[PDB]
């Protein structure tokens, strides 16, 4: 003491947060593409009319 208090540094206490993946389990399909856009065609055919 006097000039300065001596210390022991004990191990650092890091806390690495993360946002673990949950929703990306329902998005299993990956496509890397250089076309401008992606396109889907959706078709509905009711076949229950009398």
């Amino acid at each position: 003491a006097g000039l300065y208090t001596t210390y022991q540094l004990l191990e650092v206490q890091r806390k690495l947060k993360t946002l673990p993946a949950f929703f990306l389990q329902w998005f299993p399909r990956q496509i890397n593409f250089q076309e401008d856009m992606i396109a889907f065609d959706k078709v509905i055919q009711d076949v229950t009319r009398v």
């Binding site: 009711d46 229950t48 009319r49 009398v50």
Partner: protein
């Protein structure tokens, strides 16, 4: 709904299908506010006339 010896065994179904009516409206195939009991002994025949 069945008793122990197998007596009484009502067997239950629920029908909610909707067909597309002639007016294109969508309507229930089974009368929703009603219950029907039916047995194979109706012996129904699908009947087709002359074309």
């Amino acid at each position: 709904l069945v008793g122990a010896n197998g007596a009484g065994r009502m067997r239950i179904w629920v029908n909610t299908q909707k067909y597309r009516d002639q007016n294109d409206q969508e309507q229930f195939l089974m009368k929703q506010k009603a219950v029907m009991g039916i047995s194979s002994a109706i012996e129904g025949v699908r009947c087709f006339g002359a074309i």
